[PDB]
Design a binder for this molecule. Structure first.
Ligand SMILES: CC(=O)NCc1cn[nH]c1
Length: 119
């Protein structure tokens, strides 16, 4: 029933993601000195520290908005990878599976709480 519960649930899931070794390439913005052509390929950079800061600033209205930015981290990795067998891209796929497994109930609970509110 709780329309606000998603926020702390997302904070806890972000804490788990930061503990995951697979998140290391995605914890901070991609370094443009390390990858000079990054912005030629990627229009909208995204990373987990930016997601956490947006959440903590009260700049997400719903977990769907947070989920769209997290999914953008993964699609950027897929777009930038020179190979589907690359190390960083392979880490992104495992991390994506972990994220999707955990975000599912957060989204379902939120949508059901909002439907109850508007009943
Ligand atoms: C496949 C890919 O995303 N390469 C760029 C990168 C390097 N560290 N984090 C991202």
């Amino acid at each position: 029933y709780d329309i606000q519960a998603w926020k702390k649930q997302c904070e806890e899931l972000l804490n788990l993601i930061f503990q995951c070794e697979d998140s290391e390439p995605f914890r901070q913005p991609v370094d443009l000195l390390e990858y000079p052509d990054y912005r030629d390929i990627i229009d909208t950079p995204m990373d987990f520290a930016t997601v956490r800061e947006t959440l903590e600033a009260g700049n997400y209205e719903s977990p769907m908005e947070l989920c769209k930015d997290v999914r953008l981290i993964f699609s950027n990795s897929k777009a930038y990878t020179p190979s589907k067998r690359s190390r960083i891209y392979s880490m992104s796929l495992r991390l994506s599976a972990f994220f999707e497994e955990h975000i599912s109930s957060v989204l379902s609970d939120y949508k059901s709480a909002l439907r109850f509110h508007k009943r």
